[PDB]
Amino acid sequence: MIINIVEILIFLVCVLFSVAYLTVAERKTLAYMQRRLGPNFVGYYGLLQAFADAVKLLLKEIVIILVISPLITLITALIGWVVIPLGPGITLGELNLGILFSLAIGSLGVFGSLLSGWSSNSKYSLLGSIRSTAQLISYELILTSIFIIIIMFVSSLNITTIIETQRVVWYCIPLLPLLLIFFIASVAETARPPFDLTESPFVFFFLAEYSNIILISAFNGYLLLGGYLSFNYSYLFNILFNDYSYVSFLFEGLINSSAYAIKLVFLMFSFIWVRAAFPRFTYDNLINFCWIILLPLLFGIFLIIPSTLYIFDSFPTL
Amino acid sequence: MYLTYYFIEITIFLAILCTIFIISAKNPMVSILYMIALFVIAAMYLYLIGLGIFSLLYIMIYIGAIAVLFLFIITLLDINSTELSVKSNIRDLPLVLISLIVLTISGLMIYSNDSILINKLLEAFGNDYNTIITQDWFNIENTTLLTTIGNVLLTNNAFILLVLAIVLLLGIIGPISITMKHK
Amino acid sequence: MNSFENLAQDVNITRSGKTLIAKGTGGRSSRTGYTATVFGANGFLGSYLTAKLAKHGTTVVVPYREEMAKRHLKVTGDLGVVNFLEMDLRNLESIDEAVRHSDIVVNLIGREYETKNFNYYDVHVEGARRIAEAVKKHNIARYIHVSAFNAEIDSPSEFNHTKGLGEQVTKDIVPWATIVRPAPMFGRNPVHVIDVAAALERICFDDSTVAQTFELYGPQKFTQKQIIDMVSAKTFNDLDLTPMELPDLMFKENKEKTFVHIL
Amino acid sequence: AIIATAFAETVKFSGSKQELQKRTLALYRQFLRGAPTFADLYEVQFSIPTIRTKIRQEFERHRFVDDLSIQNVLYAKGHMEYQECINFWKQQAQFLKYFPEEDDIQGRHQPSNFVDKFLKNRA
Amino acid sequence: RIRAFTINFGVLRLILELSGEEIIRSDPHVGLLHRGTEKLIEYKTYMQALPYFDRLDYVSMMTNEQVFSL
Amino acid sequence: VSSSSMPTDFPLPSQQLDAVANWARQGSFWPVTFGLACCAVEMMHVSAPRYDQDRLGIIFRAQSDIMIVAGTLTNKMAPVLRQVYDQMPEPRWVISMGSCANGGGYYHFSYSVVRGCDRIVPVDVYVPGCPPTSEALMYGVFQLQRKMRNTKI
Amino acid sequence: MNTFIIFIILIPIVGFALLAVNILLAVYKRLAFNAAFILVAILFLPFDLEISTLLPYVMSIYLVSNYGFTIVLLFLLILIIGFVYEINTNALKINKHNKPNTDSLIYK
Amino acid sequence: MFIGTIILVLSFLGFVFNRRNIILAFICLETMLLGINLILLRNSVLFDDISGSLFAIVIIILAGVESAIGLSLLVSYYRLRGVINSYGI
Ligand SMILES: CCCCCCCCCCCCCCCCCC(=O)OC[C@H](COP(=O)(O)OCCN)OC(=O)CCCCCCCCCCCCCCCCC
Ligand SMILES: NC(=O)C1=CN([C@@H]2O[C@H](COP(=O)(O)OP(=O)(O)OC[C@H]3O[C@@H](n4cnc5c(N)ncnc54)[C@H](OP(=O)(O)O)[C@@H]3O)[C@@H](O)[C@H]2O)C=CC1
Ligand code: SF4
């Protein structure tokens, strides 16, 4: 009732804020990469940039379908925020099949790229929308296949089960090549420019772009890196607190969300950092990179993992 | 609280409506857009019945791949299409009004085992009786549905997964058998 | 080279006595010598009006109310031809200032709805009384007041009533003013708007149009149902013009087998 | 540049008058056949017969040219104009260079006699 | 028959005829920045004809100045 | 009615919902630049790290309501310039950078040149100079922003 | 009324609100393709769909010990030969005519 | 069994009674397979077994590979022709 509407209020309002401060963070850090001031400031007054240009963006011209694809792109980008946990067992909705949901919504996210090319059509513009679609699905493959080879060690579709399994060691440090290829497949889902031929109502694509940026950052953070995990912290508490109290649960939820947010913030900074340094791809190079060279390595990593679980006892129990 | 009762019959009515909007549409893309609406009404029904896992598999592959496939085809191809005019499609009406009756009633006949041919039909509708759900404490680990599918595809029906490999093999060979023009 | 299809001659005298000599050939860079003040040139008829008027080099004085509606009037004339100075109907001194050096002066100040600031009485008879009292004060030749069709002095409509009132007041205070009454107007019976502006420029400059009321109505008479089905005194013949017809204006298997498709 | 553009031909100079007459003949056929394209392409106000009677009266202008090589340059210039017009290279304000008398009547006092020329000293 | 579609790819117009992705022929327009600087210097002395050369090829202007002053 | 109660005097406008969108138009200003000759690089020297104008928010890197004509407008391009000026949103402005873009300039007596874009587009501020320094261009933009705010459309 | 379902009811309202403020504040008013473009999506489906044949094994990997292993290995090893079919046949590569064929100049 | 039978019968009559394009045939064929699934999965639930769900997870795959095959068949049909006809193949 009131108990949960205040809860979803706090979460929606925090995620809606953080996606808007990313649009400022990208301008600032790319300014200082190239030795410019960029935007004047970043504070509480700092939203009034991203607010002000988000207002003025609704003042240009456009030239029933045109209504629907920005809408479904933004709501597909926004519903995937429940299923990330922010701390142990803290989800906005708890479901045992969270990866199946996360995966189905990475599948739903492709439709706005199709239906955007129909509006104000030309022959060549329609072909360009086809190319953006096909690269989006092509890297969605390797996205899904590595989700499998992560949950081979878990053998559970629950997400807090993954992170509590991850307590002994993160999955990023055995499977470090997997981190590398996920980071590039993660800037492949999105149109980040090493991977951006096919770019080089608009407010919804603009918002949902950065929402997908920070949401695939979340999808990295829980399954490859430690989700909310930083260290053990069993010993520090026995000196600070005497007993469980609302101050103690506050302090632990605080440090867990800090450990999650530092993963998400470093990864998010690395997206903007890989934006600046590199030129973009020919589309033939993009498809060739996805299929001919990276995905045979993906079948190879897929065969070498269960065999390694086979050589020892080491099958994971549900 | 009994607002929350008719939820199945609602989605049945919505599926009727949604297929009426499949077969009566102007553009060829409007029909597939109501088709992905039909897949998601179906996935709501599949969650509703007690199968949470399937609904998300239907989202993954049916508004997943094959949707994108059909949207894609309708983009990069031109297809002439006429409208649902009365002068070209009212001639089909007295056959449709027979075949609706006959195919629906006969599709509701075979769930019964009597031999009267009127007691066969009247067992399809004469079911307003509430099944009683007991708790048995015999199950110890959360073998949900997907675990049992992975146990039956892999041990009891390993050959069906292994013939299935040949079918997906053929789905890779076929489009390269056709659409390449080697040399 | 461009010629004065505007003028009848090269040396012209106005009524008040000033001598005006056209310089050079007609064209953008030349000067016809006339100074014209067009009230309401931000509007829909005045735009075409001082398009034609500043085309040859009459120094057009444009009184403006808003600074942004006037900007596209800068490109219709040469250096020093079109001149902007702000005015309000309320402030006497700006009307006084705008007609100091004009040879001819027209108003098309006409508003079809009441504002919180001006009713029908305020913009049609009383503003015209104001500016035409200034025209009488400075003894400007050739004043022209464009009015509405169906301008009756006493009518159920207040718009048409006050158009008739404005006609009567401007005829009362100035005897030499000319009042022209056009039809409905369709720029892009009704009359095309370039035809109304062509008729008005031919009113502007010659003699023997003085103190003459003009009816400017097109060739053939219509009903509103006929118009929507198509979408789905002295006349023009005084000034040697033929208005354009509204209907003409109204618009204003085997090969595929031998092409290649999959490359 | 190896390949030419679409409707181009190698400019080549005939030694006889009859071959030139055949070439200008085929050329008028090309203009007259492409005349329905120009009304769609350059978005003109008016009718296709006015385009066709203009193409006719622009070949009326050079009907009585005697010298062979002046007919030759005149053919080459006409083919260049066809080349520009049939594509989208000319725009709709340079296509309407060809029709200045049609679009608008400039006003009164087109002078005819010496008096009307002389009142504004030959304009 | 190969059917190629045409597109309107500083100031520069450039026609591309495309059969899918491949360019089969290309045709650069030019002239939208032709301002007649070759004819104007015939009416100006050499001391006055000197700035017409940093007008053209403006990025490396002293070399274009130098070729005329050589 | 029969008579009037209107004043015979009122102060001049110089003598004297929507708002947040105009506050947005002030603090962000995205000119679709028509850099076509010499002055286009001086415009890119605003986008260079020295004379950024990153701070108020002009970014020249590229459907907004201002364009900037900068360089000599030839005979061939005057329809192209007007066609680009036509497909802009209605509360629109234009500033004319350089001396070749207002009153012809260095090439004023050439045959294939438009003697300033006053023959084509209605321009509101002129930034004179043949290569007018990024100093002068930015100062023209500040003058134009004052004009835009005093409009309050 | 749990806390999962207000969210996926409340987001279409957020999208409708951000859309209605846009309708309130805005201004209004076949070419041939290559076989590689069609083939990427047509062939994407049998590689997306073995993944969901792989999804029931990864949940139940403990139960099918030593035996469902070999069944999955053989399943994948039957899929790899169709993969090596398409990468032996250069299926996704798009080609053009930029080579002059490098024929030596022959005289007389 | 109502929702499955209704999708099957109405999708079937949407297949049978078109004359306007070729893609409505494909998508009505796909919704027939959906309609068979909607009956099978509820018989899995009401009988308490996975084996109808076994046939479900197999026929998902066969509907997939069916679409892949048949749309390559259409691109065969379109390569040689120019434009897919309105009346049909
Ligand atoms: C253990 C036994 C085996 C030992 C070997 C190790 C194997 C395990 C490692 C697996 C990880 C693989 C990572 C991805 C492989 C990339 C392949 C590649 O880089 O080259 C191939 C490809 C060009 O193909 P080709 O025609 O062969 O080009 C020849 C040019 N040398 O190149 C390309 O097309 C594009 C190249 C750039 C790819 C995109 C770059 C994205 C930028 C992100 C860089 C990382 C950023 C990290 C940020 C945080 C860092 C703190
Ligand atoms: N169908 C038609 O169009 C008909 C129109 N007419 C008359 O012809 C004339 C021009 O026609 P039309 O184009 O339609 O009219 P307009 O659209 O041009 O009327 C608006 C012009 O008149 C100005 N105006 C109105 N009231 C005032 C006021 N208090 N103070 C200052 N300016 C004022 C407006 O100022 P601002 O620029 O600030 O808005 C604007 O310049 C009008 O007088 C009209 O009555 C005659 C018959 C039919
Ligand atoms: S204004 Fe001056 S610097 Fe700029 S383009 Fe023209 S001549 Fe070159």
UniProtKB/TrEMBL annotation, chain A:
Enzyme Commission (EC) number: 7.1.1.2
UniProtKB keywords: Membrane, Mitochondrion, NAD, Oxidoreductase, Transmembrane, Transmembrane helix, Ubiquinone
Residues with PTM N-formylmethionine: 1
PANTHER family cross-referenced by the UniProt entry: NADH DEHYDROGENASE SUBUNIT 1, NADH-UBIQUINONE OXIDOREDUCTASE CHAIN 1
An example Gene Ontology CC term for this record: mitochondrial inner membrane
InterPro entries: NADH_UbQ_OxRdtase_su1/FPO, NADH_UbQ_OxRdtase_su1_CS
Broad class of the protein's primary localization: membrane
Pfam families the UniProt entry points to: NADHdh
Membrane topology value: Multi-pass membrane protein
Gene Ontology biological process terms in this record: aerobic respiration
Name by which UniProt lists this protein: NADH-ubiquinone oxidoreductase chain 1
Subcellular location: Membrane; Mitochondrion inner membrane
Gene designation: nad1
Reaction(s) this enzyme catalyzes, per UniProt: a ubiquinone + NADH + 5 H(+)(in) = a ubiquinol + NAD(+) + 4 H(+)(out)
Transmembrane segments: 6-25, 37-58, 64-83, 95-116, 136-156, 168-185, 222-241, 253-274, 286-312
Similarity comment text for this entry: Belongs to the complex I subunit 1 family.
GO MF term list: NADH dehydrogenase (ubiquinone) activity; NADH dehydrogenase activity
HAMAP family given in the database record: NDH1_NuoH
Automatic annotation (TrEMBL), chain D:
Topology relative to the membrane: Peripheral membrane protein
Subcellular location: Mitochondrion inner membrane
Organism superkingdom: Eukaryota
Stretches assigned to the Complex 1 LYR protein domain: 22-83
GO BP annotation list: response to oxidative stress
One Pfam entry name: Complex1_LYR
First and last residue of the signal peptide: none
Keywords (A to Z) from UniProt: Electron transport, Membrane, Mitochondrion, Mitochondrion inner membrane, Respiratory chain, Transport
GO cellular component terms, A-Z: mitochondrial inner membrane; respiratory chain complex I
Transmembrane residue ranges: none
Principal cellular location given in the protein's record: mitochondrion
Family designation: Belongs to the complex I LYR family.
Name of this protein: Complex 1 LYR protein domain-containing protein
Species assigned in the record: Yarrowia lipolytica
TrEMBL record, chain E:
Family assignment from sequence similarity: Belongs to the complex I 49 kDa subunit family.
Protein name, entry field: NUCM protein
Name of the coding gene: nucm
UniProtKB/TrEMBL annotation, chain F:
Comp. bias (Polar residues): 1-16
Organism: Yarrowia lipolytica (Candida lipolytica)
Annotated keywords: 4Fe-4S, Iron, Iron-sulfur, Metal-binding, NAD, Oxidoreductase, Ubiquinone
Protein name as annotated: Subunit NUKM of protein NADH:Ubiquinone oxidoreductase
Record-level GO cellular component terms: mitochondrion; respiratory chain complex I
Span of domain NADH:ubiquinone oxidoreductase-like 20kDa subunit: 38-143
Assigned protein family: Belongs to the complex I 20 kDa subunit family.
UniProt KW Cytoplasm keyword: no
Broadest EC class assigned to this enzyme: oxidoreductase
GO molecular function: 4 iron, 4 sulfur cluster binding; metal ion binding; NADH dehydrogenase (ubiquinone) activity; oxidoreductase activity; quinone binding
Primary gene name: nukm
Keyword Oxidoreductase appears in the UniProt entry: yes
Record-listed [4Fe-4S] cluster binding positions: 38-39, 100, 130
Biological-process GO terms, alphabetical: aerobic respiration; electron transport coupled proton transport; mitochondrial respiratory chain complex I assembly
Complete-protein stretch covered: 36 to 203 of 210
UniProt EC number: 1.6.99.3
